[PDB]
Chain A
Amino acid sequence: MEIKRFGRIREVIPLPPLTEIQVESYRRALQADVPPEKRENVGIQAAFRETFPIEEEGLVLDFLEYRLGEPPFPQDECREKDLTYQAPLYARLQLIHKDTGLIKEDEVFLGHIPLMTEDGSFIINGADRVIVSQIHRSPGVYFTPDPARPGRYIASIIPLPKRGPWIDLEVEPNGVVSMKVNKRKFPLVLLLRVLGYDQETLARELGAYGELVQGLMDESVFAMRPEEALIRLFTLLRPGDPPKRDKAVAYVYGLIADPRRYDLGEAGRYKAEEKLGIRLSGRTLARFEDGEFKDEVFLPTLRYLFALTAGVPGHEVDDIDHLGNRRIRTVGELMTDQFRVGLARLARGVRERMLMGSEDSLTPAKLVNSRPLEAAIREFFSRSQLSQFKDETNPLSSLRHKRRISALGPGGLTRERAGFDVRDVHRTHYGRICPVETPEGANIGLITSLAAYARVDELGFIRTPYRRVVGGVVTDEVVYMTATEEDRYTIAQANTPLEGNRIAAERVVARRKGEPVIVSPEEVEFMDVSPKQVFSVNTNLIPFLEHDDANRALMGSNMQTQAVPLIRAQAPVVMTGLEERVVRDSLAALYAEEDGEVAKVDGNRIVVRYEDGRLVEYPLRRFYRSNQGTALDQRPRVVVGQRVRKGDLLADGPASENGFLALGQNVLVAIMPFDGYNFEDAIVISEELLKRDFYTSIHIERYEIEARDTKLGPERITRDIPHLSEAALRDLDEEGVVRIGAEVKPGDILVGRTSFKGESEPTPEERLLRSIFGEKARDVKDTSLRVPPGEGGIVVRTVRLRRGDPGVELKPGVREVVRVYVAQKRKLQVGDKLANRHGNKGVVAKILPVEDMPHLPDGTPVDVILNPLGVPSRMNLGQILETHLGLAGYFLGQRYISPIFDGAKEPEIKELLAQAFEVYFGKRKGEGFGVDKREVEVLRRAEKLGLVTPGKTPEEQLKELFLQGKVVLYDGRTGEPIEGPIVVGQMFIMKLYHMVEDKMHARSTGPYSLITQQPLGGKAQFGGQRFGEMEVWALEAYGAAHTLQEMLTLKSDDIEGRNAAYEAIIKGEDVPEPSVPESFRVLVKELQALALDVQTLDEKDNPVDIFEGLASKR
């Protein structure tokens, strides 16, 4: 099956590594392999040098270097034993006695740092997790207008999150310039005096504006000494505390000048220098030295504010949603932030220990307690909003998870308090953030995806590539630039016609600061690389995207993440060209390292002898269970003695076919209504799909149980369970565990367990019963593990962990734990959900035998019938064009690649359909068959519909219908043709994760809640359905008083009523009258706890007791 490629645009660079946002950021933070003397002041190395040295204020503790050790356990062992994949951390510290001059050095153990796997994830307590990148406002200096009063501006200084307070500079109506700090507004001159600024200094530079400088010229504080001004400022900041200079300088220096408390950031310092046109020595607002404060940023910020208000041409306001003002915090920065938090706590315990207890006899190891540091790191990797359970339904699911961008999390926005403006598609999103891939609902615009060609720079700003255009010719030089840098040029579109490298069009479509213009070739300065750089990886997998509405393209890209792997999965007939790279970068398949020869091929491992002579053996993951329950295994694709080149495929991974992404099947589709089984998105399929094992997938479930120590005695896992027949114990081995290979059904025992009965004398009726049969009560009871309703399959694995085993950390009191893995093979059934890449989805409602399906004149039946009424109002025409191209490939036996916005057009599709008709109809004529009597009838109507040309021969009119994608179709039930030609072709359809097998649930009675005594919720708990307020309104509008009362009392929490109702039904009686609900009794008691006397009365205002006299004091 050959592959045909469309398109004209030639890409000069390939896609970057698709997981480099995760992988490269975490390597920079750790610097694990860089020698200690060559390490740069980034990552955790920068955190060590910030907290150290620690001084008592004559003892000093200093930091020299660190190193990372080998992990204790491998990745697969951590998954099986529920461990964390980590590495020990060691620090090399020295203690110096200032009074004496004696030094001691030793290496102290600091704890464990989690390690990232090769694909870019973590193993935390045995589970795979992903750290999601966070977007937030960049630090710096910003100028925005005053919303209340026109012509006025506000200057803001923003540090890194939790690294200082915000500073506001505003010109008050009275003319006084004010500075607001921590919800408190005070005149700026008071602080501006502390920085040693006199009346002669201020008016020299800012006096060239007019009336604004007069508001900074108060003589009440101008003569005041900076020390007096310092104390006065302290009183305003925190009134009530005693004014002392020692306390005063501590507060002012620690608010704007302490590097350990205020941090502008590398990005913030870079932004401040670019805007104000200054150069900063540090990352603080002011610099304290020689016993005085010196200004660094306050003066240049004030000059910009005054000049902006005056109206100088060169000063403009800032757009806060501009992508040059928003930056990304990746996993390395997020981890390092918590590392610095926990390190500051460690230094706080060092200080309290070095001034109390054996001061003369100290060692560095005795001072350092690393418990605070380990708790900070453990908390981040377990209970952070950005640390999420990994999505691995298919290899594409995990790739998308690693490129998501979230505005939520600690230091971010909130879902409820986010407005419209922060959710919009900004013009700078072009080439950096995908405009279509986002969740619908409360998270729309707050979670997004990185563009396919984008990359995050060292300061956290997203850049996109462009090609340099000089003198009308396009060069291959590629420049990555940010949004702020991009605004200065005229950028042409990627589809601009070229004659080699020369621009051929006279009029060129271009962007200037985000808006379309028409320009001459001599005005162009840059060019787009490809149309693929505007969208994300998921959106780039949808062919004919230019013919689909964006609201339905959002559904198509999202649902590709939910497709489950199939045992006979195949690659789509029509592809875009990203299917190979997705499989390669997901690390799910196996490739050869260099040239060699295959020596051994097996279902478990492959051995390759490379041309240098060395043998490398590759084990294969087989029948592994993912986080979502889908089976992940690798199948070999080579034979013994086969020569391979570097990068050749060795074994396919899940949902791949010869190295291409394979999320479904290619089926024959007819577009027509069918007897109402297609009604409102429902789908009809053929029984022939089941016969050849299409849409068949494998799922694995895990079950667990524990044996504990109790006061009454230990629980025992055993085969000898009381009161059980041999039919129940048939599949258990001698240890009480089900044998491997057994078939289990609901109610079957998996692991047998007994527990010691609690001390309780029996009821009198039971005592007489035991006397009659002469049976002695046992001391243990059945507590074994059984299959839940609606589940089952084949037992494929057992795991047994015991106390004392190496690496096993069981909780106190737990003796052993047993785990059982059960696998089932699922075929397509009524109630299962199907979808295509253009957003068309629906559940299977009918399965028909093969002789019932519509069929071609040569006897071939179709596989799927889709309703044409779902197309017009959704405006997703891409599925129609995919069907037309799939019809040509069905007869020609070829597949196609059509890139988005540069691909297959109708004249090319119609030229392929003309070749396919010559084999679809020319074959018939050679075999000795003409035109059917039934086809002549359909042709007669077809020219009354204006579909064919009158006067042509039947063969010529059948070809006219084929070029429109339509054929004559016969009815399987009657043998007569459909009255009009029907669109028939080949389409790629996926089977989604949502199956009716996992969702059907029912309940009669079961567990109840503790306090309210109402039924529990959830299928996993065997809970009932919530009958909420709006449901109660519907029953009231119907006038169904007795039906409403049953749900309120007899079926939720009337304890006496629900017991009597059950006993009446099993006796063949009608249910009795209900009584007071229990939750009303709770409300009365809770109101009495609030010292409120609530009483129920009768017609005569006499009290009525609703507690049966159980709560009345005699």
Chain B
Amino acid sequence: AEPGIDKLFGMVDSKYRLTVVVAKRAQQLLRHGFKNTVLEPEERPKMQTLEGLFDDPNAVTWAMKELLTGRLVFGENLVPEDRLQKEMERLYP
């Protein structure tokens, strides 16, 4: 079971909207190289390696954890899509 899956299912009206929000957020993290995250340094997911602890490379794992903090906003007709990417690219070149 994914951690906090019960709370994630309670945040949306339809279970398929949760999958849409998670998948689009993970694409945002991959495209900007995880520099747009809302997580604090002590909250970043980690994986254990022979050389030491490093950042978790799985973007889907990051998206689920961010959505549990309450710092993301999701909905329909929030912003124009072209204007969303332009500002996010300017903030995170």
* B-binding residues in A (CB < 8 A): 1039, 1042, 1070
Contact = CB atoms under 8 A, between A and B. Distances in A.
Contacts of B27: 1070
4 contacts: A1039-B16, A1042-B23, A1070-B27, A1070-B30
Nearest to A1068: B30
Interface in B1-32: 16, 23, 27, 30
Task: Give 3 closest A-B pairs by Cβ, nearest first.
Answer: A1039-B16, A1070-B30, A1070-B27
A117 to B, nearest CB: 63
A1070 B33 CA distance: 13
Contacts of A1070: 27, 30
Interface of B is mostly: helix
B23 to A, nearest CB: 8
Contacts, number: 4
Interface of B: 16, 23, 27, 30
A1042 B16 CA distance: 12
Nearest to B59: A1070
Contacts of B16: 1039
A1039 B15 CA distance: 10
Contacts of A1042: 23
A1035 to B, nearest CB: 14
Nearest to A1070: B30
A1070 B60 CA distance: 12
A540 B16 CA distance: 61
A1070 B30 CA distance: 8
Contacts of B23: 1042
B5 to A, nearest CB: 16
A1070 B23 CA distance: 12
Contacts of B30: 1070
A1039 B16 CA distance: 8
B57 to A, nearest CB: 10
A1070 B27 CA distance: 8
Nearest to B30: A1070
A32 to B, nearest CB: 76
B18 to A, nearest CB: 12
Contacts of A1039: 16
Nearest to B26: A1070
B68 to A, nearest CB: 23
A1042 B24 CA distance: 13
A46 to B, nearest CB: 78
A1042 B27 CA distance: 14
Nearest to B31: A1070
A1070 B29 CA distance: 12
Nearest to B27: A1070
A1039 B23 CA distance: 15
A958 B16 CA distance: 65
A1046 to B, nearest CB: 13
A801 to B, nearest CB: 54
A1070 B32 CA distance: 13
A1072 to B, nearest CB: 12
Nearest to A1069: B30
B32 to A, nearest CB: 13
Nearest to A1042: B23
A135 B52 CA distance: 74
Nearest to A1039: B16
A1070 B59 CA distance: 11
A329 B16 CA distance: 66
B24 to A, nearest CB: 12
A1039 B20 CA distance: 12
A281 B30 CA distance: 95
A406 to B, nearest CB: 54
B21 to A, nearest CB: 14
A1043 to B, nearest CB: 10
Nearest to B14: A1039
A1039 B30 CA distance: 25
A1042 B19 CA distance: 11
A1039 B14 CA distance: 12
A488 B42 CA distance: 96
A1064 to B, nearest CB: 11
A1042 B30 CA distance: 19
A159 B27 CA distance: 77
A1067 to B, nearest CB: 12
A1070 B57 CA distance: 13
A1070 B28 CA distance: 11
B85 to A, nearest CB: 15
A1039 B19 CA distance: 10
Nearest to B23: A1042
A1042 B60 CA distance: 15
A1112 to B, nearest CB: 33
A751 B16 CA distance: 56
A1039 B17 CA distance: 11
Nearest to A1041: B16
A1017 B74 CA distance: 44
A384 B23 CA distance: 58
A403 B30 CA distance: 67
A67 B27 CA distance: 84
B15 to A, nearest CB: 8
A963 to B, nearest CB: 52
Nearest to A1040: B19
A1070 B58 CA distance: 12
A601 to B, nearest CB: 60
A125 B30 CA distance: 62
A846 to B, nearest CB: 27
B56 to A, nearest CB: 16
A850 B23 CA distance: 51
B14 to A, nearest CB: 10
Nearest to B15: A1039
A414 to B, nearest CB: 49
B39 to A, nearest CB: 21
A1002 B27 CA distance: 29
A667 B30 CA distance: 58
B54 to A, nearest CB: 16
B44 to A, nearest CB: 20
A755 B23 CA distance: 50
Nearest to B16: A1039
A1042 B23 CA distance: 11
